[PDB]
């Protein structure tokens, strides 16, 4: 079973890409488990069709004593992807590290990690690279990490910080699988992300273009692969999925020093002096 | 002395709004302290003109046998605004809340909360409402909270969760000052957010329009007020500033039940069934 996590700054379509990537991968005869570990993102709604599936932690906190049933917290979606949302911390009190480990622990007990699974995906928040949101990596639940980024200053800064945390758990086998660029239609965006990925010791595994059909598919509460299998953007995600599935270039990332990261921002006009 | 924090989902220009708001407030004869508590936001770069000012935590780890000079971590920028960055956690290991605790404490010890300050602003991450990022509220250091949101479901979801933390610590004195809308140029955005704010018991403090002057200012390392004092968008931030400064409606918010928040999305066409 492949054990993948997607990290990245919020607000640039990381959850859209994860759901479209998993949808595309399911059409290749893959059994996929998707666990949302991002308390600001609906990581499964394009695959399930609703809004905000009942989360593991909300179920656990809810009134009553009866034991959780797997069917409560794991719902089948497009392509047969099993969909789970861990849920957020108790507002102002809890910690997402304990919440994420709590959800995974309970999923393990209920048998969600079935022997016929080809992939498990974690969609993890990447806006803070704290010990809590790194627990999927630290505990070896996710060994193969992909970072969604865009040609924006703090999106690349976030990715670099994720790489620092990722590098800290290299001994356990965690690797960077590659950078995924969510096109913000910035000039030279692909060139910049290719250069960033190269300095990390990795590669831009795919460039995901802006296409209005993604907003149309989401308005219809679906992934692009589901909304229009033969569309161009659907072929993009299929390329992305093919590249992930057959990716054999996994590395311990080498995060950029601050002066090199800032220099690259000047070089590609992201900031003008 | 006003003690204000700005929370919100990331990726919708919250920190743009924070830096432009404080800039606009400095033109009104105000002495302001600005503390970045958001590890994916360069919360001071548009007031200082550089990139990633040296953080309190980086200064502490590099500390020598001597102490620490306030000028190392606190730097004056546009309008005379004192600018500080806490710094994120050690990637993958640390808790971001302890970094925020430590930086505020260090600012206290070195006397940065001077008698002539009119405002201190905390630019706080709001993508996870954990115990760590609640610390400016819990610790009594931030008493007047504004939330940046847009007409997107998870942006309003995120604000609703922030309000749950805020209400939980009402006896400590923290209050919701209002919602600020960063317009994503979607239909009925202002109407939806005005309804959201009313259901919380608050109000929409200002509707901030999408405007390419903003991207122009920031690529040139500036706020809009600085980049073009006579700009239209500058006048918008000045109105926001006047609204915040004169705001006398601070409430304990009443967060919306899940079904009521989803209903609001359907009512305003944000979600189509
Ligand atoms: S470790 Fe991370 S998620 Fe947990 S409380 Fe600290 S900042 Fe929040």
Author numbering:
A (entry chain A), B (entry chain B): 1 to 273
What did the original publication write about this model?
A homodimer carrying a subunit-bridging [Fe4S4] cluster at the protein surface, the iron (Fe) protein of nitrogenase is best known for its function as an obligate electron donor for its catalytic partner during substrate turnover. Perhaps more interestingly, the Fe protein from a methanogenic microorganism, Methanosarcina acetivorans (designated MaNifH), was capable of reducing CO2 past CO into hydrocarbons under ambient conditions in the presence of EuII-DTPA, further illustrating the unique reactivity of the [Fe4S4] cluster toward CO2 (16, 17). Despite its archaeal origin, MaNifH shares a sequence identity of 59% and a sequence homology of 72% with AvNifH. Like AvNifH, MaNifH is a homodimer of ∼60 kDa, and it contains an [Fe4S4] cluster that can adopt three oxidation states upon redox treatments: (i) the oxidized state ([Fe4S4]2+), which is generated upon treatment by indigodisulfonate; (ii) the reduced state ([Fe4S4]1+), which is generated upon treatment by dithionite (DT); and (iii) the “superreduced,” all-ferrous state ([Fe4S4]0), which is generated upon treatment by EuII-DTPA.
